Amino acid sequence: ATEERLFHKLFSHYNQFIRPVENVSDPVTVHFEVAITQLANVDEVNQIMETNLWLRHIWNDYKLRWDPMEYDGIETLRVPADKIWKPDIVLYNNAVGDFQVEGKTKALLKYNGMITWTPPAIFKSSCPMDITFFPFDHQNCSLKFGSWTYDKAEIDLLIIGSKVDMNDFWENSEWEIIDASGYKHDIKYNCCEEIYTDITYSFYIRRLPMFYTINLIIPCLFISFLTVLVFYLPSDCGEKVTLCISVLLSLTVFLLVITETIPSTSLVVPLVGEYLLFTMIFVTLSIVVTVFVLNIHYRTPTTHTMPRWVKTVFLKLLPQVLLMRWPPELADILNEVQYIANRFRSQNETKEVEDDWKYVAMVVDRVFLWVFIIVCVFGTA
Amino acid sequence: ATEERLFHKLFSHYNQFIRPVENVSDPVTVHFEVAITQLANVDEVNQIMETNLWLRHIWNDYKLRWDPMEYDGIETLRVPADKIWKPDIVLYNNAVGDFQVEGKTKALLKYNGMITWTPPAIFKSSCPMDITFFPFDHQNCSLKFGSWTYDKAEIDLLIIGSKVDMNDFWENSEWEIIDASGYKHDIKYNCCEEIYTDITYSFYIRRLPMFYTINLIIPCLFISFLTVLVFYLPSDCGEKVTLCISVLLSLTVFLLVITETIPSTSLVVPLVGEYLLFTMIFVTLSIVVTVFVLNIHYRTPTTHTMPRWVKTVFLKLLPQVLLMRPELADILNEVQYIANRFRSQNETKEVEDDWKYVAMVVDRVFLWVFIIVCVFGTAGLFL
Amino acid sequence: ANAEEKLMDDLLNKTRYNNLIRPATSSSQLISIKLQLSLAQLISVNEREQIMTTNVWLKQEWTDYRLTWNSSRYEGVNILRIPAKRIWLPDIVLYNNADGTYEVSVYTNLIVRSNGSVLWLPPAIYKSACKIEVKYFPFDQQNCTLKFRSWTYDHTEIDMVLMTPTASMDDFTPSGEWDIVALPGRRTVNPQDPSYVDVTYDFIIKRKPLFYTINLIIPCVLTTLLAILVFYLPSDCGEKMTLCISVLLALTFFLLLISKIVPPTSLDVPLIGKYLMFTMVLVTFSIVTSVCVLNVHHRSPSTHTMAPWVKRCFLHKLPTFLFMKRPDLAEILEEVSYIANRFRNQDEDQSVVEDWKYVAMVVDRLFLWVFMFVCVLGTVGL
Amino acid sequence: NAEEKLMDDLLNKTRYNNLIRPATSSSQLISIKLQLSLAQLISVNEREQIMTTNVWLKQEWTDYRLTWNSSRYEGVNILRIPAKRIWLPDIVLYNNADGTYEVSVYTNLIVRSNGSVLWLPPAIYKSACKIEVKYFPFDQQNCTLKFRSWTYDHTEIDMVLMTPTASMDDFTPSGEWDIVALPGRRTVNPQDPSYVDVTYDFIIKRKPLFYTINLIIPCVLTTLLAILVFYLPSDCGEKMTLCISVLLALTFFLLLISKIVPPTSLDVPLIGKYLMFTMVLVTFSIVTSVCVLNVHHRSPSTHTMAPWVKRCFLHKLPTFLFMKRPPDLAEILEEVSYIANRFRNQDEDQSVVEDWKYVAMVVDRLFLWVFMFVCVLGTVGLFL
Amino acid sequence: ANAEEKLMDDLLNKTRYNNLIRPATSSSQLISIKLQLSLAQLISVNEREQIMTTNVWLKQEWTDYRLTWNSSRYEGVNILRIPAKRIWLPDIVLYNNADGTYEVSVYTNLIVRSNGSVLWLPPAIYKSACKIEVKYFPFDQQNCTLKFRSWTYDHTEIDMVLMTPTASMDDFTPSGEWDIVALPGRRTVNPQDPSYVDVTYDFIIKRKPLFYTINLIIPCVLTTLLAILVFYLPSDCGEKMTLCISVLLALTFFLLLISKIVPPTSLDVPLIGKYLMFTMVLVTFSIVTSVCVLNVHHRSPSTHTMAPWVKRCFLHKLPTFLFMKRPDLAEILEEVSYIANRFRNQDEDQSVVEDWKYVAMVVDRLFLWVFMFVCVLGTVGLF
Ligand SMILES: *[C@@H]1O[C@H](CO)[C@@H](O[C@@H]2O[C@H](CO)[C@@H](O[C@@H]3O[C@H](CO)[C@@H](O)[C@H](O)[C@@H]3O)[C@H](O)[C@H]2NC(C)=O)[C@H](O)[C@H]1NC(C)=O
Ligand SMILES: *[C@@H]1O[C@H](CO)[C@@H](O[C@@H]2O[C@H](CO)[C@@H](O[C@@H]3O[C@H](CO)[C@@H](O)[C@H](O)[C@@H]3O)[C@H](O)[C@H]2NC(C)=O)[C@H](O)[C@H]1NC(C)=O
Numbered sequence A: 001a002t003e004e005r006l007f008h009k010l011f012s013h014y015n016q017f018i019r020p021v022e023n024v025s026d027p028v029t030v031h032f033e034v035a036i037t038q039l040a041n042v043d044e045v046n047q048i049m050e051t052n053l054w055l056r057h058i059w060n061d062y063k064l065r066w067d068p069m070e071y072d073g074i075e076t077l078r079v080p081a082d083k084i085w086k087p088d089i090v091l092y093n094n095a096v097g098d099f100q101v102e103g104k105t106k107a108l109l110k111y112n113g114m115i116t117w118t119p120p121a122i123f124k125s126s127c128p129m130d131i132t133f134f135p136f137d138h139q140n141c142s143l144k145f146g147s148w149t150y151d152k153a154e155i156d157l158l159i160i161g162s163k164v165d166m167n168d169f170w171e172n173s174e175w176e177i178i179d180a181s182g183y184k185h186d187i188k189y190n191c192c193e194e195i196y197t198d199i200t201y202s203f204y205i206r207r208l209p210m211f212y213t214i215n216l217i218i219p220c221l222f223i224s225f226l227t228v229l230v231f232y233l234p235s236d237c238g239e240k241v242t243l244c245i246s247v248l249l250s251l252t253v254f255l256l257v258i259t260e261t262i263p264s265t266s267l268v269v270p271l272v273g274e275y276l277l278f279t280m281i282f283v284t285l286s287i288v289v290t291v292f293v294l295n296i297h298y299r300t301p302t303t304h305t306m307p308r309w310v311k312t313v314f315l316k317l318l319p320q321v322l323l324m325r326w327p328p329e330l331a332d333i334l335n336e337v338q339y340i341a342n343r344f345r346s347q348n349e350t351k352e353v354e355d356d357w358k359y360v361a362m363v364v365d366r367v368f369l370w371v372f373i374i375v376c377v378f379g380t381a
Numbered sequence B: 001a002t003e004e005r006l007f008h009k010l011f012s013h014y015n016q017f018i019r020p021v022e023n024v025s026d027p028v029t030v031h032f033e034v035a036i037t038q039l040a041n042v043d044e045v046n047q048i049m050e051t052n053l054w055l056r057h058i059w060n061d062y063k064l065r066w067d068p069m070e071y072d073g074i075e076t077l078r079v080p081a082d083k084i085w086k087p088d089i090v091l092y093n094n095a096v097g098d099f100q101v102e103g104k105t106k107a108l109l110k111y112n113g114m115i116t117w118t119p120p121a122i123f124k125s126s127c128p129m130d131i132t133f134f135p136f137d138h139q140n141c142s143l144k145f146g147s148w149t150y151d152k153a154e155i156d157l158l159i160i161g162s163k164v165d166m167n168d169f170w171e172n173s174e175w176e177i178i179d180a181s182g183y184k185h186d187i188k189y190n191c192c193e194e195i196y197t198d199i200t201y202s203f204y205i206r207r208l209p210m211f212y213t214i215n216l217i218i219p220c221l222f223i224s225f226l227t228v229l230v231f232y233l234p235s236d237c238g239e240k241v242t243l244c245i246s247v248l249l250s251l252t253v254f255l256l257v258i259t260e261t262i263p264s265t266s267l268v269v270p271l272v273g274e275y276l277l278f279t280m281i282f283v284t285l286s287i288v289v290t291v292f293v294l295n296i297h298y299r300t301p302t303t304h305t306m307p308r309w310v311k312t313v314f315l316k317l318l319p320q321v322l323l324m325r326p327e328l329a330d331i332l333n334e335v336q337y338i339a340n341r342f343r344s345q346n347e348t349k350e351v352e353d354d355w356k357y358v359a360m361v362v363d364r365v366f367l368w369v370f371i372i373v374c375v376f377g378t379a380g381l382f383l
Numbered sequence C: 001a002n003a004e005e006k007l008m009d010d011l012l013n014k015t016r017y018n019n020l021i022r023p024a025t026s027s028s029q030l031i032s033i034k035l036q037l038s039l040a041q042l043i044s045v046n047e048r049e050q051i052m053t054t055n056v057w058l059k060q061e062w063t064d065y066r067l068t069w070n071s072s073r074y075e076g077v078n079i080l081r082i083p084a085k086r087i088w089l090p091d092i093v094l095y096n097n098a099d100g101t102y103e104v105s106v107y108t109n110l111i112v113r114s115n116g117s118v119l120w121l122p123p124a125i126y127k128s129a130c131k132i133e134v135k136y137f138p139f140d141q142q143n144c145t146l147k148f149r150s151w152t153y154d155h156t157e158i159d160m161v162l163m164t165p166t167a168s169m170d171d172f173t174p175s176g177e178w179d180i181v182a183l184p185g186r187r188t189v190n191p192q193d194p195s196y197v198d199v200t201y202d203f204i205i206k207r208k209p210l211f212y213t214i215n216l217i218i219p220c221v222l223t224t225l226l227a228i229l230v231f232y233l234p235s236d237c238g239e240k241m242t243l244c245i246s247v248l249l250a251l252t253f254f255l256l257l258i259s260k261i262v263p264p265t266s267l268d269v270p271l272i273g274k275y276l277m278f279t280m281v282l283v284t285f286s287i288v289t290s291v292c293v294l295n296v297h298h299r300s301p302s303t304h305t306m307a308p309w310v311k312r313c314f315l316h317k318l319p320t321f322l323f324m325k326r327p328d329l330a331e332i333l334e335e336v337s338y339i340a341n342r343f344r345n346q347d348e349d350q351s352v353v354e355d356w357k358y359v360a361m362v363v364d365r366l367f368l369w370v371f372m373f374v375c376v377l378g379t380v381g382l
Numbered sequence D: 001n002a003e004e005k006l007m008d009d010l011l012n013k014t015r016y017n018n019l020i021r022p023a024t025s026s027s028q029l030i031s032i033k034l035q036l037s038l039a040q041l042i043s044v045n046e047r048e049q050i051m052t053t054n055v056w057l058k059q060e061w062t063d064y065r066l067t068w069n070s071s072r073y074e075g076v077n078i079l080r081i082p083a084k085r086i087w088l089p090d091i092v093l094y095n096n097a098d099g100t101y102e103v104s105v106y107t108n109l110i111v112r113s114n115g116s117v118l119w120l121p122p123a124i125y126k127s128a129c130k131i132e133v134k135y136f137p138f139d140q141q142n143c144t145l146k147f148r149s150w151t152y153d154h155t156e157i158d159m160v161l162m163t164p165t166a167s168m169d170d171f172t173p174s175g176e177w178d179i180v181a182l183p184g185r186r187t188v189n190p191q192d193p194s195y196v197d198v199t200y201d202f203i204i205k206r207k208p209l210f211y212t213i214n215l216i217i218p219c220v221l222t223t224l225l226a227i228l229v230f231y232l233p234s235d236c237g238e239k240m241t242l243c244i245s246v247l248l249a250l251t252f253f254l255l256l257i258s259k260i261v262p263p264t265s266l267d268v269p270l271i272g273k274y275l276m277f278t279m280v281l282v283t284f285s286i287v288t289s290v291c292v293l294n295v296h297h298r299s300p301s302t303h304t305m306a307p308w309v310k311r312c313f314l315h316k317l318p319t320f321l322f323m324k325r326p327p328d329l330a331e332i333l334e335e336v337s338y339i340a341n342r343f344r345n346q347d348e349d350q351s352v353v354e355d356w357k358y359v360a361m362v363v364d365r366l367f368l369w370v371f372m373f374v375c376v377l378g379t380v381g382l383f384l
Numbered sequence E: 001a002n003a004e005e006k007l008m009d010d011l012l013n014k015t016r017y018n019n020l021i022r023p024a025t026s027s028s029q030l031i032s033i034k035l036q037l038s039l040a041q042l043i044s045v046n047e048r049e050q051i052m053t054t055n056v057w058l059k060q061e062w063t064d065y066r067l068t069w070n071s072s073r074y075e076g077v078n079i080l081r082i083p084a085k086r087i088w089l090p091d092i093v094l095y096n097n098a099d100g101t102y103e104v105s106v107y108t109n110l111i112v113r114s115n116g117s118v119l120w121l122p123p124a125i126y127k128s129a130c131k132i133e134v135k136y137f138p139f140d141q142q143n144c145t146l147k148f149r150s151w152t153y154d155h156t157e158i159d160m161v162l163m164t165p166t167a168s169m170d171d172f173t174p175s176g177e178w179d180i181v182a183l184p185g186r187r188t189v190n191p192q193d194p195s196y197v198d199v200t201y202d203f204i205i206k207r208k209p210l211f212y213t214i215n216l217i218i219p220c221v222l223t224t225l226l227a228i229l230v231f232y233l234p235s236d237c238g239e240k241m242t243l244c245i246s247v248l249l250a251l252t253f254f255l256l257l258i259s260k261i262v263p264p265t266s267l268d269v270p271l272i273g274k275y276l277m278f279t280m281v282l283v284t285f286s287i288v289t290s291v292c293v294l295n296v297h298h299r300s301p302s303t304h305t306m307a308p309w310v311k312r313c314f315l316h317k318l319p320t321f322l323f324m325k326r327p328d329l330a331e332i333l334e335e336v337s338y339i340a341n342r343f344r345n346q347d348e349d350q351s352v353v354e355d356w357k358y359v360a361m362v363v364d365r366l367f368l369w370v371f372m373f374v375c376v377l378g379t380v381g382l383f
């Protein structure tokens, strides 16, 4: 029945803009702590982290005190935030939005002037990223909290505990919290001539790779497997060019997608991008060999002549190495029959050359199957 | 000035919390009318209607009255809206926020107490899309206004006219408005105790079917036309699989785009979706048949054998129904072999040519079946 | 309205009633706040961001002892419509919001009865944070909650309570995607930390699966049933690789669409999203076997030799397990003999060529059954 | 501190209530000179038919309650004052689509010794337009801005024009659109006089350098690949690939063009009709290619040849297409005669095959002439 | 009590300090606002919309003669912290903004010294409007600027001054996407305009070409080298047009990717955006010549006849330049004579057929040199 009287008498001789220090030239103590409720998302393209926090301020007051007697009971009280003086603890490394804190939750004022202010806030900070192990990577974000206008000589920012209290956290599905610690630093800035105090809270998250493996890694290896099969196809099937083109287009699509879904930092290159470019350049190199093999399969003595060294080579030396074994009226009738027989003899002699060119194309295809299968296997390892 | 005295004597004791009534038992008769300005959009995937409209309120205060002879500056007093009493007319069926667009504007004030407040408002109403004849559908999105606090015994929501005024409308390019009307009800809600009144304005719009006819009907019709051809190609060229696979891929892509366009309501299925699914099933059936004529066209007497029944049944029935209609002895011994070799080769060849004719009859059988079946189901599905 | 003005002025001015003090005239005086949520329309559920949007009318009723007139001295008014920002309020807000804000929607009038009751009822449109489970995606049932907590006070100051053990439908417009199963309500209190109390409403919903059965599911089955025809095309046709590659890309494209209606998580994957991977593996193995069969088909005695062990197993034992089976005159004499002898050598090689075209036919039939037994076993195992 | 003196006296001595128009009598319409100054063009987005502009609306009028002289309070003649202190006419854009009506931020005015008031508030605007797209590569439009007062009418205010053209003094040239003319005009209704406003037109050009050398040449390359489709030989076995690829590319280009700009509100652009015509031609080409392929693969063991076919083709049609078409001694005799007779029959079964191969050459060439002519005599209507 | 509140109670009120009146001691005297920008972090540079966003601090200084107090009357306290607003403020804001609201920054505090000096340093996040020039992408260097003007006052009232020609870069964390070259500051005034004054800070930023030199430039080069390969094919495989169409599709994909990272202006096109169009034209011409070669290769004497000029040119002249080098007995006689004469005519047909194949090989090799010569000489004009 006297809370209104207490409010009227307490909020009569009060100035909001003055520090609550009775003996001037004495720094005031502000206790700081933070609580995390939900890590909304970690944006990798724009390098922005979004969290929800409960900042906690507990500072003693040289005023705003009374006696529990007279006003029977009423040991504590709640007052609007705007009426009392508050410190302006701002977030330095902002990314987008406003520097100030949100919410207007009232402050619980104790018997001796101790004030507990716990306003909610949702922050969008800036976090550098390393993508050198993109499917399985660790990130080291950081939040920097410090007073803007006041300095060390007027503020004595301390900490409660060297840990963020995980008393209420809706767990993120894709990121796992592994560590969260805070530290206090004493720094001196430029364009200003006094020492300033700072408090940094640095998260430590880990990724769960289930979504980014069965969707990105397995198809990549499936397509990388299909490349080597070009050199086992026969040249007469007619489908030799389709396989290479399909593999190349699939690699193009996969590289495009992974490039789309990663940050554009040029400090380093991901270990997956190197492999993708490596497989891409070999896949391009395999279309060239196919064209230079299909041309040897369709050569005939009527248009091309075999040289004198492609006989000793590609037929005796290389096949051995690659384990390829090489498997009156009678006169008028006489000349008519003789011409028919001689035509057959020259047809089989020509057909002999028409299969030597077919065997050379088989050797060249085989000698590149082993070169590829080595570097393709060795390249991953 | 006399206007200052008028304002002072008006707002010397006025209170903005009490219904302006002579007694405590009389409804405040208010008139209502809605003028539409611009139909913004009729978004369907996330069913919502957006409009710009002006709300016209007229009622009769009793303490805001002055002599039009004692004073000057009479018959008009533009008073700011948030200073006098105001009925709380809100849109019930709202999609997101914007339960009441108050604004500031101004309120007219005659010398007999009347007020003619008219604030602009933009409303993101929610109306359920009904698709069965897309893109020739016919929508009936509606708006519902009502006083949220006062019941029928304290506010009487009358109506003026019988339709929304349209003499401000910037005509839309996709939707054509057919008939917009309005009507009044009396409701008794479960979480209440007294009678409540509401006024509902229902718009009746019709789509303009040209944007979706060019981009969704012509290409799909072409694709549906092209799938019949695969039964006319010869087996020797080797291009049946290309044609059927391309048709199937195009149909799948078009069906997925159509899915991306229309909402996710699981009540009724559009006719165009039914036709797309039917054509997809038919195309999938053709690829199965094409494999079984390619497997037949490449049979030889060395591997396969004719079982004496396909021969008779096919080659004796199907084309009719389908309207397909020393030393000299040594020379003889070696010469005899050459002639015998040709006799055996020719006997082999005539059997192989019989397998090629069977695959021609089978292919033409399904050409007639597909044409017949694809049209007596389309004639039933499509109206 | 001469009675209402004097009533309001006296009640809200003469006492100097301050709307910053919780009504209490005892040691504790826990002022209880009745709650009864009322649904109006289920707007949407977003399974990608795990956010669900509703349209509810929260109802609160308490008893303020500072608002009690006589109701006969004031000409019998018996009721009032004081606007919201003049009465003490308990500040009940949603405590699991998605965007981050906690504040309530538009402030309307609140009815004050003649014995001190209050019946505030503000409309609102919330956006909660649900946990979407995706394991039977076309046919799934979800469980979304709405937790309401006091933003200013707690126990030892208030005590929340319910009036009905369920949510009320009233003005409800049915949706076409989800259908309501039940709406239970429960009050959570921890009997070891006194400063805690809340009221939770469970939204249990179930999908209507005709849309994603007409789409998605049926085309997936149609394109999966085409994966076995590669084993029936003849090897000399020339479109074996055309058929078996276009199918794999079609399956790959369908998988990426499914991962677009599914939240990015690491806990659950749809049963439909696991069948596609199995079919992908089967199709890749089919491609490898088709390449091997193509290589075996195109063989000749002039480049390859048939090993004696190949001639036995294939062409004798495996095919029957698969139920399949198949002067002067001297010059004329010499010249004619050569022509006959040349024809004899050609016929002997054509028989060896035709052996390779039947070995490749037996192999393709062997893999037709093998790639059929493992397809049924995998499908059953899901 | 003469500003302190003048500011305190003017708003209180004269009882400036900021709610009453400065009228000496009932019918004393307050003239309000107007002018618009363009600053930027932003976008003329055609998907939603909504523009975006930045303007400076310069207004001027006279107030009889703001006058001071004959005392010379430290020599002050300008009394710069915030907007929300004195009467304003509330002139707003009356064709907005967003729903925003008033200026962006209320700036300060100027007040002179004789009472004149000058105001230059900035404001962004997103008006509504009717887009004519029948000449999409290079199109000319006409977009208007309407200004009106929602509190007063012609019996209270007298909106007038300073100059019949907006000012581009501070206009930053844009690299997408070209300005032609900006004529301003007034409007009034002789019947029932209560309507008054001013209107500004924004006649613009698209300066085609992005949609004329790109996306116009790829739409003719794929258009002219059809004759290539018709020139291929049948034994090559690649006709289907080329024709299907051409059709798919045309469909993709048409869909992309439709996505970029909404094709038809009442009229279709001059490129969509061309693309539809080309797609129809390509479908007919596919059908004729299938027919030619079927005709090519025929032999005198599966099909026969009617005499009318040999009369029509190979004789008359090729000429008009300019084609040329250039003891045991008795037993051994029996076996030799069989071999020779078999070869004679084979030679006759090949000539018939070569007759089928040449017929498919005439049909293929004939449709090339029709395609090359219809594609030219059908493009005059929709492009001229 | 602590005299810090007494300083305020004796300096602001009582003497009635005014925050709406300029501190000009008299007429014809200008204020001396100083300025010094300090960068803190470059957030991102956008090219699709030409918007650059930063996080900068704007220190300001001036003098107010009213804020003066004796340092000995009040014990100590040389410096006092006046809070947000509460004193005169020259409203200096960024001119060229993205939204165009000209919104002011939030107010934090003003550290006021004893001798009238006022220091301010508000933090802000700005989104200006740049003029991105894309002609050497991805090796380009840009120049986006910020302009600061007074929102209320003008010249003849204030005198903007740059405290240091360069902009401070302390407490600057760097960016892995863009570099920083120089940050000059200029002061622009017009001798004829009596009310124009501002300060402009130029940002010269160099891009780091490693996310594109490994992602876009290399695959384009590989695809072009593939595009060369068409002419080295035997023309018997039946897969000539597949390579051409696949290369064209890949080039189209790569071109469509680029047009999403480039403003849709009409002034210039990247040097990598013209090489692709050149390659598209070359590939289309290669398609045309491949169709012609395939048509030529499949000619037989029973359909076409070889003109003497074709033979004389393409079998003797061109290959040198291209370096290519190539009664019972009577009845038996009557029956045998036909068989040999049948073979003689058959060998003449094959000789003519094999001549049409060599013509299609000289034509093919001729265009391998022509296209390659153009593909290099025509490219050296693009660098
Ligand atoms: C990246 O992760 C590291 C690992 O925690 C953090 O940076 C550095 O962390 C160490 C300890 O974790 C800090 O050292 C600590 O400093 C106190 C100061 O009182 C000193 O007594 C001890 O040596 C103690 O180990 C170190 O200061 C800190 N570095 C910086 C620059 O803050 C942090 O989580 C992440 N760092 C950044 C820059 O994001
Ligand atoms: C759009 O939906 C509304 C409501 O679903 C329907 O039009 C309106 O229907 C109500 C009845 O639900 C009509 O109000 C009253 O109808 C009763 C008969 O039930 C009768 O006493 C009066 O005719 C009274 O108006 C209302 O008139 C009607 N609105 C019209 C006709 O414009 C209908 O399903 C759809 N509207 C149209 C025009 O098809």
Ligand SMILES: Clc1ccc(OC[C@@H]2CCN2)cn1
Pocket (backbone or CB within 6 Å): B147, B148, B149, B189, B192, B196, C108, C109, C110, C111, C119, C120, C121, C122
């Ligand atoms: Cl205070 C109060 C009293 C009654 C009330 O009814 C709401 C219903 C919904 C349609 N009108 C709301 N609030």
Ligand SMILES: Clc1ccc(OC[C@@H]2CCN2)cn1
Pocket (backbone or CB within 6 Å): A147, A148, A149, A189, A192, A196, E109, E110, E111, E119, E120, E121, E122
């Ligand atoms: Cl009024 C004022 C004076 C000094 C000041 O320094 C800010 C420093 C930067 C880290 N805190 C800010 N504001």
